[PDB]
Design a protein around this ligand. Sequence first.
Ligand SMILES: O=c1ccn([C@@H]2O[C@H](COP(=O)(O)OP(=O)(O)O[C@H]3O[C@H](CO)[C@@H](O)[C@H](O)[C@H]3O)[C@@H](O)[C@H]2O)c(=O)[nH]1
Ligand SMILES: O=c1ccn([C@@H]2O[C@H](COP(=O)(O)OP(=O)(O)O[C@H]3O[C@H](CO)[C@@H](O)[C@H](O)[C@H]3O)[C@@H](O)[C@H]2O)c(=O)[nH]1
Ligand SMILES: O=c1ccn([C@@H]2O[C@H](COP(=O)(O)OP(=O)(O)O[C@H]3O[C@H](CO)[C@@H](O)[C@H](O)[C@H]3O)[C@@H](O)[C@H]2O)c(=O)[nH]1
Ligand SMILES: O=c1ccn([C@@H]2O[C@H](COP(=O)(O)OP(=O)(O)O[C@H]3O[C@H](CO)[C@@H](O)[C@H](O)[C@H]3O)[C@@H](O)[C@H]2O)c(=O)[nH]1
Lengths: 289, 289, 289, 289
Amino acid sequence: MKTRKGIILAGGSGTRLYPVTMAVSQQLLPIYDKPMIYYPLSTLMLAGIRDILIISTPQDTPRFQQLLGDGSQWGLNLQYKVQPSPDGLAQAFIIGEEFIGHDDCALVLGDNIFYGHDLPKLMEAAVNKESGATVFAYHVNDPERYGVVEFDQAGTAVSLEEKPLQPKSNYAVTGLFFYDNSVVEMAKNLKPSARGELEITDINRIYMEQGRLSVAMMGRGYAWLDTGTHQSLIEASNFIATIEERQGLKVSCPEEIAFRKNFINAQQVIELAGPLSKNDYGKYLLKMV
Amino acid sequence: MKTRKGIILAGGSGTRLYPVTMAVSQQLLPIYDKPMIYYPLSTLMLAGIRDILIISTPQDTPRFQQLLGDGSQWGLNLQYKVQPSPDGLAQAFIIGEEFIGHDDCALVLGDNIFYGHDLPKLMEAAVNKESGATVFAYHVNDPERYGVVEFDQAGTAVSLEEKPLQPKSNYAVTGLFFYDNSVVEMAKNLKPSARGELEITDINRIYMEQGRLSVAMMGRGYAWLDTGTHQSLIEASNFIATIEERQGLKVSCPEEIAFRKNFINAQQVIELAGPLSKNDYGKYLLKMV
Amino acid sequence: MKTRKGIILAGGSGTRLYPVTMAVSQQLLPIYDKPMIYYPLSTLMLAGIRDILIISTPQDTPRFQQLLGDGSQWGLNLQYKVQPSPDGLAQAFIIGEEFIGHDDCALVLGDNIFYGHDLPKLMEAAVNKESGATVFAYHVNDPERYGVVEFDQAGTAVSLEEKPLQPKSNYAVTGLFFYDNSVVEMAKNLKPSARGELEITDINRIYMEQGRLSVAMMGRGYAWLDTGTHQSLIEASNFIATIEERQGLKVSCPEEIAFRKNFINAQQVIELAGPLSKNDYGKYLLKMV
Amino acid sequence: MKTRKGIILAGGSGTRLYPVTMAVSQQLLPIYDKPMIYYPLSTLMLAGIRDILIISTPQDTPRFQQLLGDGSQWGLNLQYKVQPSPDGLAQAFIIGEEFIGHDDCALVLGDNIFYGHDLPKLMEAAVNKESGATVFAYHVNDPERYGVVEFDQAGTAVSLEEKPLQPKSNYAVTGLFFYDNSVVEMAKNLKPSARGELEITDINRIYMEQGRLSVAMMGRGYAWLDTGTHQSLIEASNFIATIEERQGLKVSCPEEIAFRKNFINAQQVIELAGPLSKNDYGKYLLKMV
Ligand SMILES: O=c1ccn([C@@H]2O[C@H](COP(=O)(O)OP(=O)(O)O[C@H]3O[C@H](CO)[C@@H](O)[C@H](O)[C@H]3O)[C@@H](O)[C@H]2O)c(=O)[nH]1
Ligand SMILES: O=c1ccn([C@@H]2O[C@H](COP(=O)(O)OP(=O)(O)O[C@H]3O[C@H](CO)[C@@H](O)[C@H](O)[C@H]3O)[C@@H](O)[C@H]2O)c(=O)[nH]1
Ligand SMILES: O=c1ccn([C@@H]2O[C@H](COP(=O)(O)OP(=O)(O)O[C@H]3O[C@H](CO)[C@@H](O)[C@H](O)[C@H]3O)[C@@H](O)[C@H]2O)c(=O)[nH]1
Ligand SMILES: O=c1ccn([C@@H]2O[C@H](COP(=O)(O)OP(=O)(O)O[C@H]3O[C@H](CO)[C@@H](O)[C@H](O)[C@H]3O)[C@@H](O)[C@H]2O)c(=O)[nH]1
């Protein structure tokens, strides 16, 4: 089956970004011209995923809802589920078991920002994988900061270590994940780690250990914009701004993606743009049609 | 009577920034490493003002209160009041009458950032004017946008015009305002302008027609950033970040303002830094004391 | 045949970038960590092209030689020709006639900065195209600044206009081109245009009339860093930096490409890195091997 | 007497910035919209100094002359001398001994960028000091790297140390020194230090041990950018860029300084602007008069 459901893990308090996030949820902070959640949500839309569950902290969930709704406007089917406390990625599958049912499900952090060429192609194998899982590896300067995927001499992936003190490779596990229906049970049988969290790395290690973990390599031609500090945040906004302004196009603009992927027709775009004739975002949607 | 009372009109829908303001108050968005509101708040602090009224919309008013509280943490006394609808900056005095009372009151916009080493020396005067009011003019390329103030060959002021179609100067009146008790009654008498608003410029002009209006100039060392559009929003954040990383310091840091001005002591700083100690913002305060 | 000859047109007085280009030539301006010319050269290399002809101004040409030499160090055959005057892009073929010979040759401007995933596959068709020519279309915000390609209802490129007043599309022709042997005589027969230049558009036109012009589409996932203004040079620099500093990888590092594509081996890397062992770039090299 | 002479030391192999400096002198590199050297040179001009000697490497000195000429175009008197090898700052005076004669002379490093409104007012005292020296201190989190000056509980130049392992304070001595005429004789007497050089901190000690050393403190309203590495260079570049487009003013623009201090008139400005008009640099000056 084609992975047609996804979950956006937009929780966390964002203590890392205080006092900024103290006022507004990180996934809501604007990345140049749109709230962060738009980027990873766009990534799901690029994979053909319409049925998406957005999980946010009890405080922010109503906020996101205010911004996206049932996503009906963009041919999407948005649903919301609250996560009482940030206890690890893997819990997203528990927090949304009922949502997944017996279908394959992709997962993506709400602060996972991607930019690059064949993004859909890149996710194609992951979206069409019958059983198993797919994670995406990216070359970073600070491997220890992420889950590192080790590589032998042949090439394929042979292991996965979460924030190792001595990374076996410079490739990190990005915030985009794809699992089959079996992730739910894994998550439910998973035990917390030292930092008391249900580590997605444990779930990935389980797939790999069964020879069912595909690691999609992401070359230096793709950009995985970090959003862990105030610095990276502006560098991310400028990056995206640099690209959009030069292109006259937007990156990760859900309305457009919805429109170009035929989730909504031209009339639908106008109805959405109509009220927003002020800001440039509206004029952009209008011009796009 | 030193002006010991200031009002921050941080309301309005700020739609010009959609969708980054759909579920987030414009005044809550960040400027690099802190929320926007943090800036105009520090501005009043630098003026020695500690009794501040935070005006805003019913939806957003409680939010700032959530992030800011009463201000006691920063030796301040924050008070909030709701504005049923954006009827003009001047309504800030009608809505904050009980607040002002008989005392001189300052009004600073919740979305206006003010940078400038000597900016404090400059306000000190405004806070010491016995009667009348004081405005701060800044040289901008888009005079037509803001409010403009004309100056004779003697450098003195002569006329004020709200968004002149044909500007008589490049010096626009920033959202920093220092008034005396006569302002409250001035607002009450004001009639709705063309755009059905109580223009703050009508107040200012009145003082001028009475020679009770000073105009502090913001030389080549000042900076009055805009925050109406996405570009200006990131542009402003880029400024703060740049200057903050280079000149080694924090711009409009309420904590630093509080400690540096004896509003709070060293110990109280280390206490505020804690929830903030995962990034520079907090680690800075820790190193300051 | 496979296009194995390249011409990097790094001429120009750079008047537009004064006084920056008054001191150093544009193509030598640093794009963060390496000189500009290094990016296009890297593009040619990634295309497999090792025999290159650098065409620069009488004044700058030598600066490039001191910088690159015969290129033998990177397994490249770098030759130099002097363009007395910027008579046009097409002139790059007249100056490199003897260089081109009966072989196909690619053209790349010294300020053409390309970044994105799969740069080689994007150019593969061009490299192997038996005959004809291949250019690239990229959606930009200011088409009138470039040669605009027009597409019919089916989406097939059918027209090409140079800096038109009313762009028939938003897709501009990039600074990377691939032509067959017939480009030389084609160019040698071009007459000056309004701006008295041997327009590369005319050349491409000829190929298109004949149906020998492939217009490869360069998607929004690639970045075509602008280098027209000081503002775009710094953004281009920031862009490149945000990518490198995140992956711990360099974008457009000749030594690396040379080493990766086997143009040179590990030992040669040591020798090339030897003298620079006292600097970041040199460390990047050693760390590579 | 007022210090009317100054030396801009602009030598060095620049190997730190390879390969951007391989074919370009570091001091010729751009800092956003103008050549680096335009900064230190602007510092001197703001200090009233008009007669300046530019010392560079034998190969590089020419490129500076080709760029600045005799400097008469800006009302300056530019003279050039050569430094066969980088034996130290102090050597500048042995080189420029014939240029200095019997007058006080200032020194500025070619690659030093100073920013600050009060900068002129500050240097004023340095130029008017009857005898002695005037160094400039700035707060740097990386003292060990530079020359560090010590301040007793009172706040004076109690101790000077060149790149001390154990910084005796976080105040570094910038690259702008104002000496009296006795410095020349000091230089010629200095002896090679550990790194076989003629240390400037040594010459500075002499003045200190004579109670003749003044220390101009550069508060937080100042910014002394670094340009030693690729990262620093781009940072320094984002700095200037942001303050100009934000504050609407060019930073360290010789033409403007020349016109502001009446070294040149508007007629000359327009003529200078001509070649530079193809961009804001020209337009600015044209608009400035
Ligand atoms: O219960 C939770 C846990 C996390 N988060 C959010 O998830 C995002 C993930 O960021 P972060 O917490 O810093 O990721 P880590 O937990 O440090 O690591 C996981 O996410 C990384 C993605 O960069 C992977 O590299 C690692 O292998 C994986 O273990 C953040 O915005 C978090 O607030 C939630 O919303 N709820
Ligand atoms: O009742 C109101 C009206 C406005 N605003 C806020 O004020 C900010 C300023 O923007 P805007 O309302 O469009 O400014 P203007 O009201 O058009 O102009 C006023 O504010 C300018 C400063 O930008 C001054 O230059 C002008 O002289 C002054 O008349 C915004 O975030 C608004 O939401 C409120 O909070 N409440
Ligand atoms: O009068 C001139 C002409 C060219 N050059 C040099 O030649 C190269 C060309 O740059 P530029 O003048 O800006 O390109 P255009 O001539 O305006 O346009 C050509 O290059 C564009 C971008 O690659 C294409 O879109 C167009 O179709 C093609 O005609 C550069 O290195 C320039 O410095 C000059 O210095 N002066
Ligand atoms: O004979 C020489 C020595 C240096 N330089 C140049 O001076 C600049 C300054 O950098 P560097 O040589 O590394 O400065 P240091 O020698 O490390 O230190 C000196 O310059 C510092 C400011 O950067 C001061 O704080 C110190 O007290 C002073 O001793 C560079 O572009 C050098 O190439 C020359 O041109 N000629």
